Structures are given as structure tokens and as C-alpha cells.
A paper describes a structure:
VhChiP is a chitooligosaccharide-specific porin identified in the outer membrane of Vibrio campbellii type strain American Type Culture Collection BAA 1116. VhChiP consists of three identical β-barrels, each containing 16 β-strands connected on the extracellular side by eight hydrophilic loops and on the periplasmic side by eight short hydrophobic turns.
In this study, the crystal structures of VhChiP lacking the N-plug were determined in the absence and presence of chitohexaose. X-ray diffraction data of ligand-free truncated VhChiP were indexed, integrated, and scaled at a resolution of 2.40 Å in monoclinic space group C121, with a single trimer per asymmetric unit. The final model of the ligand-free truncated VhChiP was refined to Rwork and Rfree values of 18.0% and 22.6%, respectively. Inspection of the structures revealed that both truncated structures existed as intact trimers, indicating that the N-plug truncation did not affect the assembly of the protein. The average channel conductance of truncated VhChiP was 2.0 ± 0.4 nS, estimated from histogram analysis of 60 insertions, similar to that of WT VhChiP.
Numbering used by the authors:
A (entry chain B), B (entry chain C), C (entry chain A): 20 to 350
Amino acid sequence: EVYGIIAMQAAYRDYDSGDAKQDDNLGGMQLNNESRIGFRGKKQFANFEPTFIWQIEGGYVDPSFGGEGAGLGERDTFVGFESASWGQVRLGRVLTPMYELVDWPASNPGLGDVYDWGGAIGGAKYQDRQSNTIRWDSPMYADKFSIDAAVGAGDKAGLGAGDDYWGGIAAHYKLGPLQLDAAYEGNRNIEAEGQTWENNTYLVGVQGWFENGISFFAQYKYMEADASNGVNEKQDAMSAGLMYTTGDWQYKLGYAANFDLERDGKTLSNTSDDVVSAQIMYFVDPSAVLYARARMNDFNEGLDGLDDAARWTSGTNGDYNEYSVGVEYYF
Amino acid sequence: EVYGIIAMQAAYRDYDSGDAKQDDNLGGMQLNNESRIGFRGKKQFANFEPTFIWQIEGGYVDPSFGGEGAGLGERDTFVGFESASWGQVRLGRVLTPMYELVDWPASNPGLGDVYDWGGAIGGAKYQDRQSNTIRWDSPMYADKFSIDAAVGAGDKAGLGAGDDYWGGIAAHYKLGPLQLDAAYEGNRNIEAEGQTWENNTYLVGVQGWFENGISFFAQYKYMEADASNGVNEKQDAMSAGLMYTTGDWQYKLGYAANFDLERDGKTLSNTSDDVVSAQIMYFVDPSAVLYARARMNDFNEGLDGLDDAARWTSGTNGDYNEYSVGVEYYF
Amino acid sequence: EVYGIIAMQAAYRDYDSGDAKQDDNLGGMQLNNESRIGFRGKKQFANFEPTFIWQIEGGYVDPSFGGEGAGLGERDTFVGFESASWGQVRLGRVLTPMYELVDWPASNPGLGDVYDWGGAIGGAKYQDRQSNTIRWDSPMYADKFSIDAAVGAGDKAGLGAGDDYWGGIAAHYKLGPLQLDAAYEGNRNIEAEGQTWENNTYLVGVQGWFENGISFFAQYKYMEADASNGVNEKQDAMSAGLMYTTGDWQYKLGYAANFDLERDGKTLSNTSDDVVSAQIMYFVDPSAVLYARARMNDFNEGLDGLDDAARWTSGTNGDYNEYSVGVEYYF
Ligand SMILES: [Mg+2]
Ligand SMILES: [Mg+2]
Ligand SMILES: [Mg+2]
Ligand code: NA
Ligand code: NA
Ligand code: NA
Ligand code: NA
Ligand code: NA
Ligand code: NA
Ligand code: NA
Ligand code: NA
Ligand code: NA
Ligand code: NA
Ligand code: NA
Ligand code: NA
């Protein structure tokens, strides 16, 4: 089976970095082509009862700020087995249990700069899509409770260049119109800024869908990092979204924030970020949507790593607003 | 739906750069594999009259002078909408209206070193296939007149690294056995050789296909560029082709040339290129062709840009002749 | 048609390089995803009797020690023609006749570090998968005898950076349960270590499949190299595998070795490698296999090239053992 998500966002950005030429370079109108094509299949082996599953998914073919061209396997690409009793196991490149909740619902619409890869903690707060991963997905026990658990090699280890690794777990419980979400991830042996780090990240959240057309989500996220020289860091964060759906339309407000980072008990000032976002979406077909989106990113003002050099954050390139229209079509 | 052009040229080149070791490296037999796989489709949205269209086309999988392997999205890759009243609008990565006519008919057979990316003018005479583009293609009004128009982001703007942009327009009129072609492209905020450039390129052409088996194309291209320091540059060029088609055979002579560049009113000597090409093509199948081809490229002898450094042209590597056989098949 | 091999090997390696941090870096658990997607087809041209053939095969989507993503055209990618009287001719990226026998059977299971790309001779003992190649595959004359022959450009020449080339031939003869194999490859104008090299490799080998469930292979490989400064080098090598297949199971022991390199008649001590490997395989489906594998790599201890610099070998990263399980599925 060939599948695909055809997705195209025309997005205008207006940057306020403090440098006008940089604002000219980063800002302006671009096309964010997140179209991808993938291949997947099942096969029932004659001599093995768990059903074989597999997927090979290409990357974004032309994202904004990037060149054309994606290879096959850049996104979720795996093999596995699935049973009605124990759910499914996947080996390969997949989303960590924590990141899947960070990405959805908590990064939509355009909150990712702050809540996905945003933040200021050292080490690696969590992986997102990670290769060299084994991931178990429980079935939805009693149609209300499921578990996601995974471990895998780190980024450096996947190149034979390190021994970083990570493990994570997430749970979901359905309670009436609500879903409750909790997740953990632990990153070990993370090499950065001349230190070896350990990261621990905890997430709790809630999601609601109501028959009057309101739906919403709220998430709290707590990140701790410990470096080998004794330094401890802490940063937490939140994301929330409110939606109203009526006929063929969805109205959505979203907000997400990282709070000031605390190093060794001391709060580093102006190390917070937040983003406010408004979106109108049109259900143009059961297989497609049209959307318009406007958002505002106010980033942190800078921070040094443990090597006395500037640590990179999603605010390094400066504050910016964004206006966009987009289409996404699934097949 | 999956489509493809299976394209294979076995090409022998004999260079004459003036350095025998460089002739040895650059010359010799190679296999130019321009085979490409693509994906496309349409979708009539329930709630939108213009039909949704999309395409994702992979690159040349193993061209000569390049390593193996191509990603999806390297060639024309877009979304868009179409309607019989107002035509087609495409967003993503497409051919500029000007470049399309430069490429076909005027670059065939093997005239592209001179007429396509050949030239000496500064800035960017035109884009060829460009991401971050919106392109309107009109219906063929009265089955005779159509309009291609496009604006897009520049090469550097595509990476958040600059603020270049461009706009282009082309028109075609069918008149008996003739087609009349005209095209403009203007490139802006082009950063090169220490300056910011504006380019203006104009093209006029004719094509004819006659019942006696003769067909032909002839084009004139006018390139002007102006630099931020006041320097003005001008270069013009021609391409022409003559075909005789009898039964399953087509014989073809092509010729193209860039004439001497003029900078601030003064002609720069020996800045011209020309190419003379001969080809025989066999219609081996309604879906495929075989061909043999020989061509002479005599390039310019060098020029400097406005940074007092050598400006790269397609002649930088030296003159060369080329004899080749090829196969193209379409599905 | 779309076809694929879905291949996943979870491999744990334990290195003994003599550097504990390198051992931690190179070793540990990885996922080796060699899943690959391809496209192939034939076409009967209306005006040409030999059937047109073509294939475009993608790379490994996520191999161990490598990043995710592969393009189309990274594995066997070609056009060609086939007729019954004379076999098939392919043009493009294919395996050389010598390499095809090195790889299968003589590299399985996991012998490749030693027998495939392993070794210490200078220049280029042979290509493996090579672009810019023309390869003829004879039919099986008298239902017992076939021939493979090929000529191609070199690694450098396919980028326009040299004039290396190569040619190769192989022959197979069926003798009851046996197949006899022989092959030759010659490489020319190989530029390495300040010299230009000529390589000559010869291979003889036997495969047998007996109805008792016993099968085996045994190969002897002889490698000669001549540098432009007069230096001669010689190294030979061996690969053997023993298999017992009963029911849905295949047991396998393999062994391969490169022996000490001789330079100008003098044996260079400790320039040998060998590998011993055991494997159990389960025919889980007519389309798929599960396997478990353990192997031990004992690599050479270093040598200099003719430029007084260390010559890279598959032992440069140091000795290692490896334990793994895998699935391969074909569609
Ligand atoms: Mg990662
Ligand atoms: Mg461009
Ligand atoms: Mg090679
Ligand atoms: Na810009
Ligand atoms: Na892009
Ligand atoms: Na799950
Ligand atoms: Na060459
Ligand atoms: Na190539
Ligand atoms: Na048009
Ligand atoms: Na060890
Ligand atoms: Na490691
Ligand atoms: Na990998
Ligand atoms: Na063969
Ligand atoms: Na020894
Ligand atoms: Na060793």
C-alpha cells in the first residue's frame, strides 16, 4: 500500500531579531511543503501467529528554510508484530511515547517552536522521532486504558560515535469525554558542552471533547537535567488549546510557554518563551482540510551553556510572528 | 498514480581544456541516467469546486558527473487547484514560465550547456526549477492563446538566508502551423560578487510543424543585469532547431549561441559560446525513443565578475565534443 | 511494479579496539534497517524485438552506523534489453561479475567485513555495486553454463575526476548438485597513495546443494596490485560456509580469511583477518525468514600504504564480536 500526506503551508514571517538584515533573511514569504509519501504493509506469516507489520515513510519533500528532496525512511520507518492480546511492537525509527504527546495535541497550531524543540535545558530533554528504537504499544484495555513504552539508542550511538541511550513510557486513560495523559522520558550518557548529562522529563495532561462542539487540551511538562560536573538545571512548561467545531469549521486558540530556567537553584532571568496562536480550519473534504493561522513567538533572551558559550535555543534566531494558509490531504 | 521517465544516455566526451590531465578526468565515457519516478493525483473536494491537484517527482537517479541516488521532491513537486474557466494554479516547486521555453524546445538536442545554464551575465538571468513558487497557467483561450505567470522566492530566500525574489510571465499563440512564444523574467535582490543585482531577461520565439515533415524552432533571448554599484551588463543569445520527420525517424540540427557580453557599454572579447548539434531519433515505440547524437561546444575564454574574481560559466571546465546514444521511455 | 525487501537486524557489537571509549562508542546495541523499495518493469517496444527492461532500486533506509533516509537509485538501477538468443544487457548501476560471487554466497553470514570490503591490498581489488557499467548476462547455454561480463568507469571517472575503469568476467557451470564458479576483475588507472594502480583479482569457487539437507560453498580469492612506482603487492583470501537444512530450519557455519599481505616479495606480518560465524535461520513464511547470528571478527593489526600513511582497512576500527537477530521479508 502506498499512502501519503500532501501538505502545503504558505507562511509569511516577520522577524524582530534586533538586526534588520537578519530579519530580512529569516522573514518573508516561503512555502512549507510537508508532503511525504510512504509505503506500508502487513503480512501474516505461515509459521508465526503475530502479524508482521512494516512501514517506510519518506520525509518532507520541501519544508520552508530547507532544500528540495526527501529520502525514503526519513520519518516513521519500522518493522514489527501485532496481536489482539498484547498490542504491537515496532523496531526501527518511531516517536518516543513522550514526544508523541508533545507533538499531538500540544504543538498544534504552530506551538512547536516553544513546546516541541523549544526550551533551554542542557543535555536532551527528550528524543522526538528516534531510530534504533523498540516501542511497545499496548491495546486499549477495556476500551479506556493504553500504554506506550520504548527504549532505544541515542543520536551519537546510532552513528557508532557514543553510548547515549534513552527510555520512556506514557499512559492514557479515558474517562467520559476526557482523556488523561502522563509520560516520562529518561536520557542517559548525553554528551554536550564538555559534560555528560542525564535528563528526566515528566508530562501530565488532559484532553476534552464535548458534544456541544468544544474541545480542549492542557499539558504540564517538567524537565530536569544533571551534568557530570554537578550542575543541575530545571525548566517547566505548559501548552493548552481551546477549540470550537461547528458544521465544517473549527476555531482554535492555542498557547504554550516555557518558564525561566533554574540552574543550581538560581533562576536565570529572561530564559522563558511563549507563543499565542489563532487558527481557523475548514473541513473541505473528509480527506482534507483548509486552514488559516496566525501566531506570535516571544522567545527567551539568551543563555550560556556549561562551556561558557551560547547555548542554542529556538529563540536564537529571534522573535517572530507568522501568518499562513495551508492545505493537507490524506490518502 | 505512479509515473516515470526511464532515461539513459551513454555519452562520450572529448575535452580540450588546455590541460591534458583535466581533459582525461572530465572526458571519457559515462552513463547519464536521468530516470525518474514520480507520484501525482487529483481529488475533487466535497466542499470546493476547483479540483485539487498534487505531484511529487523524484530527481535524476544517476546522472553523469554525479553520484547515485535521488530524493522525492527534487523535480516538479507541488499542490494546486484547477478549473476549466480560469485554468490551473500551482504552489511549490515548478518551472518558471521563461525557463520552460528555454528548456523546451530551445535546449534540445544537447544545446543546454550554452542556452540553458550557459551565459556570462551576473546576477541570475533566470531561475529554472524553483521552490517557493506560485504559478498560474491559463486555459488555452479559444484553443489558441495561453498565459503562464509566476512569482516566487529566490534561492537564498528559500533558506532564510536572503531576500531574493523573482517574477515571470510567458505567452503563447497558436496561429496556423505556428506557435508564437514570448516570455519575461525579472530577478531581484540577487546577492553575488559583493553586490546586489537585478536581472531582466526577455525571450521571443517561434515554432512550426508542417505536413511535409519539416518542423523547427527559433528563439532570441535578451539578458540585462544591473548591479548595486551602478554597473550594467547585457548579453543576448539565440537557439534554433530544424527537424525532418519521415515515418519513424526524425533528423535534427540544433544551434545555439551566447554572444559577447557587454559591460557598461564595452564589449568583453571572447565571452561568447556556441554549440552545434546533430541528432537522429527513432520512434521505437509509441511510448519510447532511441537516439544518437553528436555535438560541439565552443565556450568563452573567461571573464571576471565585479569582485575582481573569475566568474564561473559553463565554459569554465573547457571546450568539449560529445557523442552519445540514449533511450527514453514514458509511463 | 513496486517490490521491496523489508530487512531488520538488531545487532549488538562488543569491540576490543584497545581504546575503552572507542569500544563504548563503536559498540553497543544498534538497529540495522536494510529495508529497500524498488521499481522495475519491462516493455515490448513495437519496433525492436529485444524486450526493454529497467529497474530503479532505493538504498537501505536506516542501516546501523548511519543516518535515516535513502534515495531511489542507490542500489541496482539500470536500463537494458534482453533476448533469448543472447541473454540480457544492462546499462547503469549493477554488481560486477566478481562482486556478485563475493557477496553471494561467500559473504553470508556476516563474512563481509573480512571477505567483501575487507582486505589490505592497495589500489582497488574490485568494485562492488558500480555505476557507469555495461553488463552482459549470457543465457544458460546447454542448460548448464552461463557467463557474466562487464566493463565500466571507475569511482573517480564517474564524477569527472579521473579516468579509472575496470572490466570483469565470471562463469558458472552446473555439475549435478554442484555449481563451479570462476571470475576475474581488472581495475586500471586507480589513483591512491600518490601512485596509480592496476589491480587483478581472480576467484574460483564451488557451491553444492545435496538432497540430504547439506549444502556448502568454498571460494579461493587471489588479489594482485601494481603501483606506478614499481611496487607489487599480493594477498589471497578464502570463504567457506557449511549449511544443514531440515524442515523449516537452516543451521550455518561460515568462515572467511584474508592472509598476510606480501609487498615486493616480503610478507607483512599481522596483515591477516578472519571471521567465524554461526547462524540459525527459520523459514517463517515462503516470503520471509527469521534468523539468529553470532560472529567473531579478528582483524589485522595495521599497515602503511606507499605514501608512509596508515592504509584504511576494515580492521582500522578494531576487533569485534557481534550477536544479532533479524527478519527479512520479500514482496
Ligand atoms: Mg534523536
Ligand atoms: Mg533557483
Ligand atoms: Mg565503485
Ligand atoms: Na527572506
Ligand atoms: Na524548501
Ligand atoms: Na499507543
Ligand atoms: Na575521465
Ligand atoms: Na552518475
Ligand atoms: Na501553460
Ligand atoms: Na570490550
Ligand atoms: Na556505541
Ligand atoms: Na541507522
Ligand atoms: Na548471469
Ligand atoms: Na600472523
Ligand atoms: Na586483531
